[PDB]
Amino acid sequence: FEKLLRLMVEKGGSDLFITAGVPPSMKVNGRVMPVTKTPLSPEQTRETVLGVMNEQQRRDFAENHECNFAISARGIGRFRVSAFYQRNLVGMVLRRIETNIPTLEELKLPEILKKLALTKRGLVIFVGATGTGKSTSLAAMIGYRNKNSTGHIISIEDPIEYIHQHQGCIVTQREVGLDTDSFEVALKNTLRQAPDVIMIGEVRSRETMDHAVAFAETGHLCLATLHANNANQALERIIHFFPADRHGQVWMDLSLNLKAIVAQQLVPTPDGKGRRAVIEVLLNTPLAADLIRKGEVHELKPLMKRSTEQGMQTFDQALYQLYTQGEITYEDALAHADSANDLRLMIKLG
Amino acid sequence: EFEKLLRLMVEKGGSDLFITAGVPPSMKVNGRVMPVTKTPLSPEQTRETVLGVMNEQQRRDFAENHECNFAISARGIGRFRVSAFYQRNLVGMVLRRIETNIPTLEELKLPEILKKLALTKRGLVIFVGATGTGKSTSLAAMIGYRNKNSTGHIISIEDPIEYIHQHQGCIVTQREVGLDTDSFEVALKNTLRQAPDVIMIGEVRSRETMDHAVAFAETGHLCLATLHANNANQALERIIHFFPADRHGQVWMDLSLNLKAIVAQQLVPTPDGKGRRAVIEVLLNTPLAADLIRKGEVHELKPLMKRSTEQGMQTFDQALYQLYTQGEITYEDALAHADSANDLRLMIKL
Amino acid sequence: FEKLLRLMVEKGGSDLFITAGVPPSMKVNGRVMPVTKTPLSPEQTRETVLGVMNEQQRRDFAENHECNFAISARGIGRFRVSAFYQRNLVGMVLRRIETNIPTLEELKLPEILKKLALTKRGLVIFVGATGTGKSTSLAAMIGYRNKNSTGHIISIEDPIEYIHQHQGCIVTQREVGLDTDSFEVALKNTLRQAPDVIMIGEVRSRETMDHAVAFAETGHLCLATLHANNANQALERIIHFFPADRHGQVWMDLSLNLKAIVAQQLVPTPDGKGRRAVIEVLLNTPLAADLIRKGEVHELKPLMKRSTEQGMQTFDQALYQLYTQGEITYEDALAHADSANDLRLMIKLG
């Protein structure tokens, strides 16, 4: 089993497949390819899947017919497993935890992210739908701060998607369910670990939101991801974490400590061989803070269209900057625009 | 060995010591993480060093909960608080040095109005300021003044405890959240039944903490607390936002009735660049100030503080004016730190 | 240990202090004074604090780091204890349960309370902030009915603040957590114990409110305390105990059985050596009952200003009656008034 893991790391496989009826196959560059010539038997698949679990994980797997966990192989790396029943037979899919962190330039992200990465204190939020590259761009941005500054970075992820090696800053990566019992317990102790930047993998409850706000008030850089399309809907979801009586405080605290909200979309390139990351940037200018303090989240979209000199940009302005660069077609810009008539008016204007 | 690393931190004045795998033993001296040795720590050495500080029971809680926060006492060196944690399935710990020497108000060169406030019998005193402006340092110095100049019981609820005051004229009960109490709210709820004469809340972060502080002052006890806000006006704005708008009318009335003073603190560098001086903005609850508080006219506070310097009040511009005339700050540092660079330039020229 | 309790009762100490680092000290007349000459060791403090708990209280104290309970010493009296961890060391504060009940005249309460104390059936509610003397004035009023009538008084408190000796009425004092499992269980059995007056220590839930309403319908005198500033806000909190569909019944039941709502404030005397109890009285006149039946709680404040002949009085009318008596200054009246302009108009009018 340990030999199959080294082959995946040496060959750069994205995912390993262990199920009955097919040989051990790995997805290398998106192509499922068999590793051996002999398919796995139901007994060998049941012996291989259960052999990776401990006594408690074997109990949860037999009761719930499913079990998702993570493992750490000494000297090889880490990988996330998704075990499952299939046709009343055991099966598991393993995903290698990547370590080669792309840079902000390799992702072709705007330069305002670099200034945000070197910020000393504040709250930065990565919004976007599922799989829009939020964690990918965040880890790329995390590598920028790790390489360009000195300090301590504390990470709480569920799961850890990228493992950053110790560069200029000390990097402590903790995964929920292995290194900590929950997000709340880790963030509660993150303050006493003398961090300089704290990255919450995802804010899913009000307790996670309170810790993120308290992190920024103490002069630390707080980063987190949340599932929302743009900056306006992200603020709407955050305020709904709290009862209405605490909204007045939430609007005031958000207007005081927030630094930026980065919304990310993935639009296909003209050649169809890849996807480009569209970034909507909202910087906390004094006018934006007043709109936040008043809860006038509706007034945010017009304000971002007039302050492009400070570093802000909507999705229509970012798509306008990418279509003029030739990185996206004309049809892809109008289909991905927040307003297909404004983007058509923005492109026709110059 | 380990005891030698503690003496080096005390002799070099390190704020925090870092013990984790992948990086050499590093200490945060003056906010800069610096390695102590040249050889990084191995996972076995980090696991042997972290577990070596725990007893048999702390090693059991650490293995079950993946986290363990505790405190230790080294004979002849001092005390330090540790925050152990799992990180990438590896052990790690951060140690924070606890300070036992409590300075005096004269050593901090604080205004004499603080001494009269320290000996007050009942009321609410609030320390405002940005992160690291010496709020807790000046408060502990003020706490040592009341502890040495009066008889009674002082109850302290901190997160964490930054200074440990020995029993002087008053009985000093220091309780830290997470070790001596489960939360700020639980400790303040029981603080009333412990017969205190002065109660110091480490920081007010919610409305429940604010309600207890108000109830503490109504019962004839001296209540002190810290909050993160630049000046007195913004501190009042943040406090009222803790509550829904329907309860604002009561909050303005209660604040106008029990409040004693609001002390805003700024740190300006001395002319020689070798240190920083604490600038103190003092707002005393005169009858005119109480009426402005009862009406919610927080905007009318800044002009009122400029005309009542005889009673003990002073703005940041008046305090910076008193320090620049003393030679404790340059002319450029006064205009850059002034709330109004034109008023301070007019105050100095007058 | 039993000798230290007798010394506190013989010397009239308000609170006894048992913590490491200081001798056993008692707060007599507000002055913390040491009893012995030798301070207590951590082992002696740990042996004294844990020695008062049973096996279960020692388990809750070790797990939660805090434990509040009550004890009964045969032949001495009762005292409430608040144990706590402090600097990872045990400590406890003991408060003596007072038995010398002040009378209504000693508290200088209005005579309408005497007529309310001798009432046969109905609901009387003591409102006020934390520590406004609600339980103190109630126990004083309880001693009036106990001494001036014959019957059975049933008390459910959490905790019992005053212990009334058997006078004209039979006095059964039950404390939650020692004499009963909960407020609901005690009130459920209070009906089958043939009472004539039932005092609920505090109404904190709807189940407690339902029992109080049912107590008054059965021809018994029901008294209870709740935390609210005045009569209007007390009614708002009571109706919010119930869903909106049951509000129509609650308004009708309140208009039918309620007798009075007594709001209490504590204003300092001119000499600054004490505090005087300000009492806002709202009597259930037919016009008030109609405003209650319609839910027009807003219409209550104007009605109380016009029916001073029946025994009602607002906070502004009571403060007007105390300022004319010389028991409060002119500045203390305008600062504590519900309307500083109406009280200024009430005082200027005569």
Instruction: Starting at the earlier edge strand, list the strands of the sheet with C31-34.
Output: C31-34, C25-28, C15-19, C89-96, C77-86, C66-73
Binary contact (B190, C68; C-beta < 8 A): yes
Element (H, E) at C223: strand C221-226
Nearest to A200 by CA among A217, A183, A218, A182: A183
Burial of residue C149 (CB within 10 Å: 0-12, 13-18, 19+) is: middle
Distance CA A221, CA A240 (A): 24
Binary contact (B131, A166; C-beta < 8 A): no
Binary contact (C32, B192; C-beta < 8 A): no
CA distance B265 to chain C (A): 29
Nearest to C1 by CA among C39, C47, C54: C47
Is any Cβ of chain C less than 8 angstroms from the Cβ of B190?
Answer: yes
- CA-to-CA separations, C331 to A61, B257, B287, in angstroms, rounded: 73, 11, 9
Amino acid at A129: A
Tokens representing C192 are: 């089958």
Q: Name the neighbours of B, counting chains with at least 3 Cβ pairs within 8 A.
A: A, C
CA-only gyration radius of chain C, Å: 22
Cis previous bond, B160, omega within 30 = yes
Contact B257, B290 (CB under 8 A): yes
The CB-side HSE value for B299 (13 A sphere, CA atoms) comes to 0
- CA-to-CA separations, A6 to A3, A11, A14, A36, A96, in angstroms, rounded: 5, 8, 13, 14, 11
Instruction: Starting at the earlier edge strand, list the strands of the sheet with A25-28.
Output: A31-34, A25-28, A15-19, A89-96, A77-86, A66-73
Contacts of B79 (CB under 8 A, 6+ apart): B71, B72, B73, B98, B100, B164
Contact C308, C296 (CB under 8 A): no
Contacts of C318 (CB under 8 A, 6+ apart): C110, C278, C279, C280, C281
Distance CA C206, CA B192 (A): 27
Burial of residue B72 (CB within 10 Å: 0-12, 13-18, 19+) is: middle
CA distance A312 to chain B (A): 27
Element (H, E) at B290: helix B287-294
Cis previous bond, A110, omega within 30 = no
Tokens representing C260 are: 């009075």
Q: What is the DSSP string of C145-182?
A: HHHH--EEEEEEESS--B----SSEEEEEEEBTTTBS-
Total Cβ atoms within 10 A of residue A7: 13
Element (H, E) at A149: none
Total Cβ atoms within 10 A of residue A246: 20
Distance CA C133, CA C135 (A): 6
Alpha helices, DSSP H only, in chain C?
A: 2-11, 42-52, 55-64, 112-117, 134-148, 183-190, 206-217, 231-239, 247-257, 286-293, 300-304, 315-324, 330-336, 340-349
Contact A230, A236 (CB under 8 A): no
Total Cβ atoms within 10 A of residue A118: 12
Contact B257, C335 (CB under 8 A): yes
CA distance C214 to chain B (A): 31
How close are the terminal C-alpha atoms of chain C, in Å?
59
Distance CA C219, CA C283 (A): 18
Tokens representing A217 are: 């008030």
CA distance A140 to chain B (A): 19
Tokens representing C10 are: 């013989």
Of A175, A189, A252, the CB nearest to B83: A189
Of C27, C31, C335, the CB nearest to B256: C335
Contacts of B20 (CB under 8 A, 6+ apart): A170, A172, B41, B46, B87, B90, B91, B92, B93
- Residue B137 phi, psi (nearest 5): -70, -50
Tokens representing C321 are: 């009656």
Measured between beta carbons, which residues in chain C are less than 8 angstroms from residue B55? Answer: none
Burial of residue C182 (CB within 10 Å: 0-12, 13-18, 19+) is: middle
Distance CA A125, CA A115 (A): 15
Query: Tokens 């004269």 identify what position?
Result: B106
- If you count DSSP H runs as helices and E runs as strands, how many of each does chain C have, helices first? 14, 13
Contacts of C126 (CB under 8 A, 6+ apart): C134, C135, C137, C138, C223, C224, C225, C226, C262, C264
Nearest to B301 by CA among B337, B255, B268: B255
Q: What is the DSSP string of A234-297?
A: HHHHHHTTS-GGGHHHHHHHHHHHEEEEEEEEEEE-TTSS-EEEEEEEEE--HHHHHHHHTT-G
Measured in angstroms, the resolution is: 4.5
Nearest to B36 by CA among B18, B20, B48: B18
Tokens representing A226 are: 């949340």
Distance CA A178, CA A28 (A): 28
Q: What is the DSSP string of A171-211?
A: EEEEEBTTTBS-HHHHHHHHGGG--SEEEES---SHHHHHH
Contact A247, A235 (CB under 8 A): no
Q: What is the DSSP string of B57-125?
A: HHHHHHHHHSEEEEEEEETTTEEEEEEEEEETTEEEEEEEEPB-----TTTTT--THHHHHHT-SSEEE
- Residue C264 phi, psi (nearest 5): -125, 130
| Percent helix / strand / coil, chain C, rounded to 5 | 40, 25, 35
Tokens representing C120 are: 């046969």
Element (H, E) at B151: none
Contact C78, C71 (CB under 8 A): yes
β-strand partners of C277: C266
Q: Name the neighbours of C, counting chains with at least 3 Cβ pairs within 8 A.
A: B
Distance CA C98, CA C90 (A): 26
Distance CA A108, CA A2 (A): 37
Contacts of A185 (CB under 8 A, 6+ apart): B65, B67
Give break positions in chain A: residue before each, C–N beyond 2.5 Å: none
- CA-to-CA separations, C250 to C197, C231, C242, C247, C255, in angstroms, rounded: 22, 16, 8, 5, 8
Distance CA C270, CA A67 (A): 72
Is any Cβ of chain B less than 8 angstroms from the Cβ of C269?
Answer: no
Distance CA B220, CA B129 (A): 26
Nearest to A311 by CA among A105, A103, A121, A110: A110
Binary contact (C336, B190; C-beta < 8 A): no
Distance CA B82, CA B93 (A): 7
Tokens representing C182 are: 């909960």
Distance CA C123, CA A113 (A): 65
User: Which pairing describes strands A15-19 and A25-28: parallel, antiparallel, or unpaired?
Assistant: antiparallel
Q: Report the phi/psi class of residue B220: left, alpha or beta, with left for phi > 0 and alpha for psi in -120 to 50.
A: left
CA-only gyration radius of chain A, Å: 22
Cα-Cα-Cα-Cα dihedral sign, residues B80, B81, B84, B87: negative
Helix (H, G, I), strand (E, B) or coil at C73: strand
Q: What is the largest CA-CA distance in chain B?
A: 69
- CA-to-CA separations, C81 to A38, A280, C5, C67, C332, in angstroms, rounded: 73, 59, 12, 8, 36
Contact C138, C180 (CB under 8 A): no
Of C15, C93, C335, the CB nearest to B290: C335
Tokens representing A348 are: 């026709």
State the method.
X-ray
Query: Which letter does DSSP use for residue B162 in this model?
Result: -
Beta strands in B88-240 (DSSP E): 90-97, 123-128, 152-158, 170-176, 198-201, 222-227
Contact A334, A344 (CB under 8 A): yes
Distance CA C185, CA C196 (A): 19
CA-only gyration radius of chain B, Å: 23
Q: What is the DSSP string of A81-140?
A: EEEEEETTEEEEEEEE-B--PPPTTTTT--THHHHHHT-SSEEEEEE-STTSSHHHHHHH
Of B16, B86, B237, the CB nearest to A180: B86
Contacts of B147 (CB under 8 A, 6+ apart): B154, B165, B167, B168, B169, B170, B172
How close are the terminal C-alpha atoms of chain B, in Å?
61
Which residues of chain B from 141 to 160 reach within 8 Å of chain A, CB to CB? 160
Cis previous bond, A159, omega within 30 = yes
User: Which pairing describes strands B16-20 and B90-97: parallel, antiparallel, or unpaired?
Assistant: antiparallel
